[PDB]
A paper describes a structure:
Base-J (β-D-glucopyranosyloxymethyluracil) is a modified DNA nucleotide that replaces 1% of thymine in kinetoplastid flagellates. The biosynthesis and maintenance of base-J depends on the base-[name] ([name]) that has a thymidine hydroxylase domain and a J-DNA-binding domain (JDBD). [name] specifically recognizes base-J-containing double-stranded DNA (J-DNA) through a JDBD which has been structurally characterized. In the context of [name], JDBD recognizes base-J and then probably invokes a conformational change in [name] (25, 26), enabling the THD to initiate the biosynthesis of base-J on a thymine 13 base pairs downstream the complementary DNA strand (J + 13′ position).
Author numbering: 392 to 561
Amino acid sequence: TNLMVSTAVEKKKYLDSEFLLHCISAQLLDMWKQARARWLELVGKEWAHMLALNPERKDFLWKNQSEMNSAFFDLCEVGKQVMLGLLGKEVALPKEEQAFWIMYAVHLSAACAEELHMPEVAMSLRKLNVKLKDFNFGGTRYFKDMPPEEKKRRMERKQRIEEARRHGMP
């Protein structure tokens, strides 16, 4: 566990565009770049407001109904397809998924500290993991009330990301 996290720390760069380039389809890579930037922009906007109101705070309060929360779910959906694209498989071994999600949470936590200059403890691995767990148990669990139409939109989005991963193939 501690080994896995520290291996992920060395390798947080594996989710940088320069390391992803040519290991996944260019279409998936662009979806990853957009989704990462969208999430970070929102976290940064929310942080800046919370900070203005309490300059001493070190915790990021994650809002359950926000645009940031919705952007995080989408980033996860893109992330999962990145994993499958790197593996060249439709279904990962559980140990492979485990290692990936650690790298993912380490990469994003590092970005909040290094790119948005937030306190390291604000967006911790633990916090990202809680949200990740919800994502990996689905949309109905993650968004506790989701209107049926929103569920279809999420499904359609996932389908599009999958097709991207397969270079436009079903």
